[PDB]
A paper describes a structure:
It is essential for motility and responsible for binding sialylated oligosaccharides on the surface of the host cell. Cryo-electron tomography (cryo-ET) of M. genitalium revealed the tetrameric organization of the nap particle complex, consisting of two P140-P110 heterodimers. The P140-P110 heterodimers form the ‘tight interface’, while the ‘loose interface’ is formed between the two heterodimers.
In this state, binding of 6′-SL is not possible. In the ‘closed’ conformation, there is no density seen at the loose interface, whereas in the ‘open’ conformation, P110 and P140 come into proximity at the loose interface, thus indicating an interaction between loop 662–666 of P110 and loop 1173–1179 of P140.
Author numbering:
A (entry chain B): 59 to 782, 789 to 1348
B (entry chain A): 27 to 255, 261 to 412, 416 to 789
Write the structure that this text describes.
């Protein structure tokens, strides 16, 4: 029962909890503690070949019950421990006895009444470790605590052949080649099935029009239900004239021939529900620090996985399928990509069978039969979304209490995250209490049905992020959660969030998979990366064209209007007269649809905008959702609607309004919104968010200008490049990059004076890799960029396919006379939303991954012998019109500039190391060339998010890897303020570690008014083995990826970027590039940058504390960089930043302050007066030493108790009258008698006994405190007339 | 003490225990000595006095082109049953029994000479129906600008010939001039009668304004295709008799009564009260040109006459917006012999689909959609180029207009005439004209001119007259621009994207009217002979299109348009497909109902009057009207760029959109709570479908909770001046049922309510 000093306070990685600050009637701390003993040999528990995970996990839990102890001790408001609470070892525990009104029976000096018997489920609960604690908002002395199996901590220490990665490194004995895991051969036309292709429209309706055209007519798509039971009469979306390659048998997604040692969860969602020892548990309990019966239990609830999985939407029973079905399914399977919306090929963490169901077959629907009319009907399902062990504990942690209920928002995932596997919080649980806390109920729901009410008006940051959904919840939001807290009157949630997939939205032309390996690998689950990768030349004209149209021009000699190569230079002018001929004739019905003769193409932002799940003005407004992100790729914070969260039902009911279409004829007229069938309640849940935020209160190109301002944590230098003509150029923004171009000759020459800029002269910086005839012709470019299919001569303007006859026969050409000056992935075009490559999703993805410091770079050359790339006489920043400026323009990370990113990282030149590492990229013109991506050398990842801490009534922030981030203005916005402030870590011994977040020991608000964070350079861990006996060219680690070869033709020596750089077969390329394939392992990047060993020097240990920069009402004011009156907002913000590169602290950007401490850092314990590191540094209550209760021999009882005790206090508030305070409490001379009084806590008039607690004005805070030293029994005492 | 409408004639006070009071059921229609044919329309409580609006189904109004008493009740067949507003006071020893106090009879307007000239040739589109189709709405494209101006067979001469036509620099010769009236929805004169059949397709079916043509054979053919209870094929027409009856059109056996009678009986719809005035306006379903203003001191036996909305010079926010609205009414210098129209006789917008009427703090607040009214030709012969054609055009702001709301709305684009059509921008299309003012493909060439689509050589031989639409859609042209305008799809390509306000289509009218200008309105109503105008200063108008999410194919709204959006299946009204779940059969025509002003109960700064904001329902979202109680005027901010603060549109979700708007029964405001409530009575649904199938879901009720949100005015020293419009928030409250017949909701208390 009493305190044991052998248990030491600690922080759990999954929630970063260490202690709860108790407040109200008796303040103090609860905090987690564990046994300090080393030599924990978990590998002594044998795993055989003939047994399953469950009896192994029970043997590990039983073994760890011998090797380790855990508890939640209470401390006073000065940091001093009271009682132990080792839940596995406490003697004769009990639940609390109740009155007939359900109230717990209580009297403060006696404590609670105990029933004399333990709670339910006590034999299986007692082994679990407590990991989070919270206090009731409305009920006194009432608390909740969360318990989990010991493997929810120790999972990282269990043996690697059961706790596998989602990928394997192998022996690499054939030499390493990352294409060996990739299905890569392209599909082909079926030599026996050509005749079923979509028909050309033989006659087209006049509609009383007059214009005419010679171009090939629209394709029909006919679909109708017919009279047969399980066949339509027509179903033209189901047509399938293509088939796969037969390279040593058929190429298709087929798990049983590919995953020979398939990854699967530790336990299934059904096992965790039935095996009561393996589920998480929340219990209510009661505590009183100075009673005889000081602690006892309330109620026990299991956080049952079936109460989450039976609350998933109907579409989550068929995650292999989506509401477009058959045509999308076939286009995906032909391109060798995932089908559905949340399939286990990308997201196995939520599936009971993991990689064993990572295939396109058996989608819950009839598909693949010999007749196109037979496909597209509902059937039985065998691979639904679940909640298996790894995802389950990431869905646990981050508690809050509201009314007669308590919630669980889930963790950051560091209960169960591995290097290649991403368990995350997918929803929220609730426990609700009934009959005055005599009874309970437990439930939970996924974030998809909660966040679906999000809209563009609900954020002061960027618009159009991929956070939208529809009547089918195929957008699946999940978070690494920082926490949930009260920010003054408003309840707030924070963390990092998954968007929809921004990267794989563009889709390949059917034959070209052999030359675009990264885009297919990123679609295959092989490249688990969410950053957008530039690949434009191999994309089809349109992602959504039905596959029966793809064969309409195999030669390319007609530039087949319905299906062709994506390039924007060669597409229609459809003017005042033209639309009535080429497209407005094809009217259609309840059983007919069409594909139109319009030529269509665009760059990455066109593809992304067209088929990503962007937010709009309306909610439920995303009828296309390409896929879901592998890991969190956004910051997040939001205001959560606490009374609506209190008022939502436990059970969620869906119906036929959330089912996918049962047949394709009902899919043909598919309503995007429909009435809930009024017994159902699913649509109520959408309104739990009032407001949200994602980054700075900035808009358009201004957000890219902010991206350049922050320092890179690998070296402390800004991405801006302006603090030092042959000088280098920035990576994210476009200001001062290339040349000032007059846009007055852009468009079809159509209208470009006062249109796009706040000033008389329309000057725009054209960016890197731009196209011009000459420096004298820097304004626009004329049409000359024609592309053949073979050597087959020009695109042929003024030909009959490029003409129409209008009313009165006055024919004219349907093509552009002039074009935009740039296509490069760095492009910013205010005037051209289809040639711009920057986008609002990418602006937020770049913000997060440049904070985490792990944006990759594109390479041709390593630092090795004869391989080297140079700073001098090999790069020309002033000549970005030609190959000597070394812009890749293919395989590059979107929105940014690679050579500038390489320079800011210091991969070439003396920027980051004492000698030139000579790693980089060069655009050669003499021969074909090969390329691949590599990491920055840093190891942080987007799940590395720590405690949400609330600073005051409107300001809050959190730790995020090497940063602390603050959302200072989100609750009460202002004009001219950026709304975010940031502090960087400084310690290179943390920043260059191989799993760096394991050194963070928790974050807290401190008594001097600053948030602070704990760090320990001794807490880092190596990789699972030392590579044993061989060089592991692939080394699985938290910043590794299987980046594929991209191969390309020679760059032109002049006019280099006037056309896109042409790709070639990459399937054999890996043998030509071995020096780059070795640099895929991030340890070799550290070795070549000089960071890989003790060569970093500095502190040998030096653990301790970190603190955010000082702040005032002026901090983050940028009102002179906002607005416009003489130029464009990003350009004046660039002028405003360039005088301030030496003085970033007034912008709210800079390095943290830091202080060292000796020994281990394990965790804080916190209370309203003080914070104690490791629980050391406790105090004598030095402000209150002179204050004490009078002892029983100093009281003359009949002087007090001649009057009944009924009138010694005010009945409306229970404080004792002022004159009787010095009659019961000793106080020093000259003391302020108004600063202290006594509160009655229990009494009985028939015994004349009065029980009291004292309250005093804290010198530090505008609030009352107890005086802890006031007696040998603490702040509580009793007085009675000699009758005790 | 909760007075609840027991039926169409009985109102009874319910105790807070949700129990009727003994001997409290009262027959108000008989209590007011009005025959049983009367019924109660709307009731309000003001100083614990219950007022009632009585509208009878026996009323019959006749219109005569000749004479003075042009609009008068048809007393020949005992049809002189004008509508009454009756003040009822509880006058006893504290037991609920109402009594006559005053009884004001609302009389038909007196038509001046100018209004007479306008109404003689005026024609009203048949009312919007619950079961109405996009295709139904759709009207075949009219003569293009070049066809109207230069004539036929004048191609490639635009450039040359445009100068003398005061159309200089005009970049769209193929710009629609309107919609042909030869087909579509039935356009009938006031003295005529609407049909019960709505054409499925308004490009092919229906005979439009040709009443003689419709009645000759097309009426019989439509009757054959669409019978009245099925046996009908329903391939060209829909028999919407049941829906016409439901939304309040009077019927003689089967044929509806005359249009003047229908308009009057619709105008007797709602009731807002003041300590000195009582105002009555029309319902939301079909327009209402005239609204009665009642002087509470007027004699019991005296006559109360309304004011023509045409005589109410509303302030649309900008003189430029007002002239936009004015210029589409019709040609100005008609001078044929009598071919006068609304614009020619100098009258403003004549028809509003009044969403609702309410009062607070002695101030009256009104809101509603601007009902489209435009000129049309009635030459009947050679013949006019524009013969049998509506003269309307979309007025969307151009792509290069200066960023900012003010600039947007003030943009000269379509000042006088048509300029929009089809255009190409980079890798996408913009139906909006890319240029305005003096902007072109080679520089600056001079101002862009626009003119009314009427040939000048025929200035004396073109007979132009006005019409009134049944919906906000001013221009019915089966065209892309039209659809875009309807759906709110028009966007600029600049750095900061903006929705292009269609200054003359889907316009949303709202404001607060003060007692002085109400007295001015009453004086206008009293005016005899010369017609006198009414000035409403504290009013505003906002382009409020239907959400694009209600139309199949349109996924999002942005400057970049997906190429498939150019297809005829989304370019035209007729090709458009509706996925509207709010009980409407259409997804083009917006519709508003249920304005209820309320006092903000939250504390306010001392010396500052308490906030009162009004909430109005629309298609796919709520609208909050923000007012400055310090001046009792619309909330406004100094920075022009900012959208008028007075306006705030918050979209709905699946639960709110599912709530039929055709079933709005009553709206109650909880004064101490500060939360609205929108009672929807499913029972209001028509008996039979538009295809004569029985309605299977006529049972149930639902409510929507409208709660204030955002940052309010005069909250604290720091919130004395505002920049962000307070925004409402609608949530499906949780009071829903399908098996029950609603009788009334009781705002029992803060924490409780009864059903």
């Amino acid at each position: 029962q009493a305190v044991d000093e052998t248990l030491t306070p600690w922080t759990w990685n999954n929630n970063n909890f260490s202690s709860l600050k108790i407040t109200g009637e008796n303040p103090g701390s609860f905090g987690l503690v564990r046994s300090q003993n080393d030599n924990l040999n978990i590998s002594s528990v044998t795993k055989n070949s003939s047994d399953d995970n469950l009896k192994y996990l029970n043997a590990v839990e039983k073994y760890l019950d011998g090797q380790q102890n855990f508890a939640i001790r209470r401390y006073d408001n000065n940091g001093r421990a009271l009682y132990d609470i080792n839940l596995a070892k406490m003697e004769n525990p009990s639940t609390v006895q109740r009155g007939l009104n359900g109230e717990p029976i209580f009297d403060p000096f006696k404590g609670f009444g105990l029933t004399g018997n333990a709670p339910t489920d006590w034999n299986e609960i007692k082994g679990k470790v407590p990991v989070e604690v919270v206090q009731s908002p409305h009920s006194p002395n009432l608390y909740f605590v969360l318990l989990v199996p010991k493997v929810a901590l120790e999972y990282h220490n269990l043996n690697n052949q059961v706790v596998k990665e989602s990928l394997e490194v192998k022996a690499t004995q054939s030499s390493f080649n990352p294409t060996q895991r990739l299905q890569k051969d392209s599909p082909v036309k079926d030599s026996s099935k050509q005749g079923e292709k979509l028909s050309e429209t033989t006659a087209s309706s006049m509609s009383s029009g007059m214009a005419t055209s010679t171009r090939a007519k629209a394709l029909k798509v006919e679909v109708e239900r017919g009279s047969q039971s399980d066949s339509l009469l027509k179903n033209d979306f189901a047509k399938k004239p293509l088939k796969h390659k037969n390279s040593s048998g058929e190429v298709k997604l087929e798990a049983e021939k590919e995953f020979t040692e398939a990854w699967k969860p530790l336990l299934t969602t059904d096992q965790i529900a039935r095996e009561k020892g393996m589920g998480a548990t929340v219990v209510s309990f009661y505590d009183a620090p100075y009673s005889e019966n000081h602690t006892a239990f309330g109620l026990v609830d299991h956080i049952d996985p079936k109460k989450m999985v039976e609350n998933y939407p109907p579409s989550w029973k068929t995650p292999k399928w989506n509401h477009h079905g058959i045509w999308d399914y076939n286009a995906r399977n032909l391109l060798l990509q995932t089908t559905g919306f949340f399939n286990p090929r990308r997201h196995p963490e939520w599936f009971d069978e993991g990689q064993a169901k990572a295939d396109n077959t058996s989608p819950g629907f009839k598909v693949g039969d010999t007749d196109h009319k037979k496909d597209g009907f509902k059937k039985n399902s065998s691979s639904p979304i679940a909640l298996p062990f790894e995802a389950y504990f990431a869905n646990i942690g981050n508690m809050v209490a509201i009314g007669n209920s308590v919630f669980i928002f889930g963790g950051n995932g560091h209960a169960t995250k591995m290097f290649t596997t991403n368990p995350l919080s997918i929803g929220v649980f609730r426990i609700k209490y009934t009959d005055n806390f005599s009874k309970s109920s437990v439930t939970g729901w996924p974030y998809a049905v909660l966040f679906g009410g999000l809209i563009n008006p609900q954020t002061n940051g960027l618009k159009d992020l991929p956070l939208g959904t529809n009547r089918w919840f195929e957008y699946v939001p999940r978070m690494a959660v920082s926490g949930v807290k009260w920010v003054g009157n408003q309840l707030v949630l924070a963390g990092t969030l998954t968007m929809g997939d921004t990267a794989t939205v563009p889709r390949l032309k059917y034959d070209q998979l052999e030359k675009h390996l990264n885009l297919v690998a990123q679609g295959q689950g092989l490249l688990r990366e969410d950053l957008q990768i530039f690949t434009p030349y191999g994309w089809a004209n349109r992602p959504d064209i039905p596959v029966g149209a793809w064969l309409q021009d195999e030669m390319g000699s007609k530039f087949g209007p319905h299906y062709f190569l994506n390039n924007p230079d060669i597409q229609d002018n459809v003017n005042n007269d033209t639309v009535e001929a080429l497209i407005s004739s094809y009217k259609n019905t309840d059983k007919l649809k069409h594909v139109y003769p319009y030529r269509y193409s665009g760059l990455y932002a066109w593809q992304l905008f067209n088929w990503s799940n962007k937010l709009t003005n309306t909610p439920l407004s995303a009828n296309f959702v390409n896929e879901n992100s592998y890991a969190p790729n956004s910051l997040f914070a939001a205001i959560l609607n606490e009374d609506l969260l209190t008022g939502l039902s436990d059970k969620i009911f869906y119906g036929k309004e959330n089912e996918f279409a049962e047949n394709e004829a009902d899919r043909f007229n598919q309503l995007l919104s429909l009435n809930p069938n009024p017994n159902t309640n699913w649509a109520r849940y959408l309104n739990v968010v009032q407001r949200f935020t994602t980054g700075p209160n900035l808009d358009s190109s201004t957000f890219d200008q902010f991206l350049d301002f922050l320092p890179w944590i690998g070296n402390g230098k800004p991405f801006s490049n302006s603090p030092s003509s042959s000088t280098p150029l920035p990576t994210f923004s476009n200001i001062n990059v290339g040349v000032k171009s007059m846009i007055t000759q852009h468009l079809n020459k159509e209208n470009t004076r006062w249109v796009f800029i706040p000033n008389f002269s329309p000057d725009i910086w054209t960016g890197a890799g731009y196209r011009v005839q000459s420096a004298n012709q820097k304004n626009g470019i004329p049409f000359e960029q024609v592309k053949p299919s073979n050597n087959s001569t020009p695109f042929d303007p003024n030909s009959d396919d490029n003409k129409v006859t209008p009313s009165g026969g006055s024919s004219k050409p349907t093509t552009y006379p002039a074009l935009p000056n740039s296509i490069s992935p760095t492009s910013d075009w205010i005037n051209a939303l289809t040639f711009t490559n920057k986008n609002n999703p990418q602006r937020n993805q770049l913000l997060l991954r440049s904070l985490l410091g792990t944006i990759p770079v594109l390479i041709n050359k390593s630092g090795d012998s004869n391989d080297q790339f140079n700073k001098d006489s090999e790069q020309k920043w002033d000549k970005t019109e030609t190959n000597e400026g070394n812009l890749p323009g293919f395989g590059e990370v979107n929105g940014l500039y690679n050579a500038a990113l390489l320079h800011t990282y210091g991969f070439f030149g003396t920027n980051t190391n004492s000698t030139d590492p000579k790693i980089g990229f060069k655009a050669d013109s003499s021969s074909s060339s090969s390329s691949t991506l590599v990491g920055s050398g840093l190891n942080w990842t987007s799940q590395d998010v720590g405690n949400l801490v609330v600073i005051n009534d409107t300001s809050f922030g959190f730790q995020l890897g090497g940063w602390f981030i603050t959302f200072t203005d989100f609750i009460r916005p202002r004009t001219g303020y950026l709304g975010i402030t940031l502090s960087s870590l400084q310690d290179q011994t943390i920043i260059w570690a191989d799993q760096p977040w394991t050194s963070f020991k928790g974050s807290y608000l401190d008594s001097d008014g600053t948030p602070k964070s704990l760090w320990d350079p001794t807490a880092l861990k190596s990789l699972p083995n030392s590579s044993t006996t061989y060089d592991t060219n692939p080394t699985l680690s938290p910043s590794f990826q299987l980046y594929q070869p991209n191969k390309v033709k020679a760059y032109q020596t002049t006019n280099t970027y006037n056309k896109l750089i042409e790709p070639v077969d990459a399937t054999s390329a890996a043998t030509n590039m071995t020096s780059l394939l070795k640099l895929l392992t991030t340890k070799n990047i550290k070795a070549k940058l000089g960071k890989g060993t003790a060569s970093s020097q500095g502190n040998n240990n030096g653990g301790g504390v970190s603190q955010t920069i000082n702040t005032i009402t002026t901090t983050g004011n940028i009102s002179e960089g906002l607005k416009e009156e003489t130029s464009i907002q990003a350009e004046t913000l660039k002028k405003f930043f360039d005088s301030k590169q030496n003085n970033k602290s007034e912008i709210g950007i800079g390095d943290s302050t830091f202080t060292k401490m000796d020994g281990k850092l394990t965790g804080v314990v916190s209370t309203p007066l003080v914070n104690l590191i490791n629980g050391q540094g406790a105090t004598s209550d030095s402000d209150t030493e002179k204050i004490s209760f009078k002892p029983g021999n100093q009281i003359d009882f009949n002087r007090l108790f001649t009057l009944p005790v009924t009138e010694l206090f005010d009945p409306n508030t229970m404080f004792v009258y002022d004159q009787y305070v010095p009659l019961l409490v000793n106080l020093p001379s000259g003391f302020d008698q108004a600063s202290i009084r006594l509160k009655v806590i229990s009494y009985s008039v028939e015994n004349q006994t009065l029980g009291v607690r004292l309250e005093f004005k804290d010198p530090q805070t505008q609030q009352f405190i107890p005086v802890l030293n006031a007696s040998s029994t603490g702040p509580q005492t009793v007085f009675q007339p000699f009758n005790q | 003490t909760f007075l609840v409408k027991e039926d169409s004639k009985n109102v009874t006070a319910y105790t807070p225990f949700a129990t009727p009071i003994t001997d409290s059921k009262s027959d108000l229609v008989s209590l007011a000595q009005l025959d049983s044919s009367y019924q109660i329309a709307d009731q309000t409580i003001h100083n614990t006095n219950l007022f009632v609006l009585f509208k009878s189904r026996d009323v019959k109004v006749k219109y005569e082109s000749s004479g003075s008493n042009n609009i008068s009740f048809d007393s020949t067949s005992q049809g002189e049953k004008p509508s009454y507003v009756v003040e009822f006071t509880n006058s006893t020893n504290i037991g609920i029994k109402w009594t006559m106090v005053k009884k004001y009879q609302l009389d038909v307007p007196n038509v001046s000479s100018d209004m007479n000239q306008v109404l003689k040739n005026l024609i009203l589109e048949q009312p919007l129906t619950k079961y109405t189709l996009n295709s139904s709405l759709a009207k075949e494209k009219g003569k293009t600008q070049r066809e109207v101006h230069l004539g036929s067979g004048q191609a490639n001469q635009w450039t040359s010939q445009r100068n003398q036509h005061d159309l200089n620099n005009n970049p769209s010769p193929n710009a629609s001039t309107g919609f042909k009236l030869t087909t579509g929805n039935a356009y009938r004169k006031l003295s005529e009668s609407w049909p019960i059949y709505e054409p499925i397709d308004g490009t092919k079916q229906g005979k439009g304004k040709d009443s003689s043509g419709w009645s000759s054979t097309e009426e019989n053919e439509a009757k054959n295709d669409a019978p009245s209870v099925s046996s009908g094929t329903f391939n060209k027409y829909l028999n919407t008799k049941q829906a016409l009856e439901s939304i309040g059109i009077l019927f003689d056996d089967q044929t509806p009564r005359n249009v003047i009678t229908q308009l009057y009986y619709a105008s007797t719809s709602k009731l807002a009260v003041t300590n000195n005035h009582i105002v009555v306006m029309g319902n939301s379903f079909l327009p209402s040109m005239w609204y009665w203003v009642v002087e509470r001191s007027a004699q019991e036996n005296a006559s109360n006459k309304p004011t023509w909305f045409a005589n109410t010079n509303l302030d649309w926010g900008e003189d430029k917006q007002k002239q936009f609205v004015e210029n589409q009414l019709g040609y100005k210098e008609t001078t044929s012999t009598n071919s006068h129209n609304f614009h020619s006789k100098s009258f403003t917008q004549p028809a509003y689909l009044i969403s609702g009427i309410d009062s607070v703090n002695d101030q009256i607040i009104f809101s509603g959609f601007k009902a489209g009214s435009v000129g049309y030709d009635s030459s009947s012969s050679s013949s006019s180029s524009t013969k049998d054609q509506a003269l309307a055009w979309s007025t969307t702001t151009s792509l290069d207009s200066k960023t900012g709301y003010k600039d947007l709305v003030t943009n000269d684009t379509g000042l006088n005439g048509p300029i929009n059509g089809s255009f190409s921008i980079q890798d996408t299309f913009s139906f909006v004209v890319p240029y305005s003012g003096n902007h072109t493909n080679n520089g600056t060439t001079g101002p862009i001119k626009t003119a009314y689509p009427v040939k000048k050589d025929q200035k004396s031989t073109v007979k132009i007259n006005s019409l009134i639409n049944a919906t906000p859609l001013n221009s019915y042209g089966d065209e892309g621009i039209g659809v875009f305008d309807a759906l709110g799809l028009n966007y600029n390509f600049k750095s900061n994207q903006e929705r292009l306000p269609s200054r003359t289509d889907q316009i949303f009218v709202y404001g607060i009217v003060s007692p002085n200008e109400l007295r001015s309105a009453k004086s206008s109503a009293d005016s005899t002979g010369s017609d006198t105008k009414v000035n409403w200063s504290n009013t505003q108008s906002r382009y409020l299109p239907v959400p694009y999410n209600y139309s199949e194919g349109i996924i999002d709204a942005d400057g970049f348009k997906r190429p498939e959006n150019r297809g005829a299946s989304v370019t035209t009204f007729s090709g458009l497909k509706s996925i509207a779940p709010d009980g409407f059969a259409n997804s083009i025509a917006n519709f508003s109902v249920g304005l209820k002003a309320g006092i903000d109960p939250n504390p306010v700064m001392s010396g500052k009057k308490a906030n009162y904001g009004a909430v109005v329902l629309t298609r796919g979202g709520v609208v909050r009207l923000n007012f400055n109680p310090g001046n009792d005027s619309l909330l406004s901010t100094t920075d022009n760029n900012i959208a008028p603060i007075s306006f705030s549109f918050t979209p709905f979700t699946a639960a709110e959109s599912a709530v039929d708007l055709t079933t709005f029964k009553e709206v109650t405001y909880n004064q101490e709570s500060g939360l609205w409530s929108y009672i929807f009575d499913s029972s209001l649904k028509p008996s039979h479908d538009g295809k004569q199938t029985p309605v299977t879901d006529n049972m149930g009720f639902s409510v929507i909770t409208v709660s204030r949100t955002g940052i309010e005015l005069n909250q604290d020293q720091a919130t004395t001046t505002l920049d962000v419009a307070p925004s409402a928030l609608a949530v499906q409250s949780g009071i829903q049922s399908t098996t029950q017949t609603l009788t009334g909701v009781l705002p029992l208390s803060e924490e409780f309510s009864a059903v």
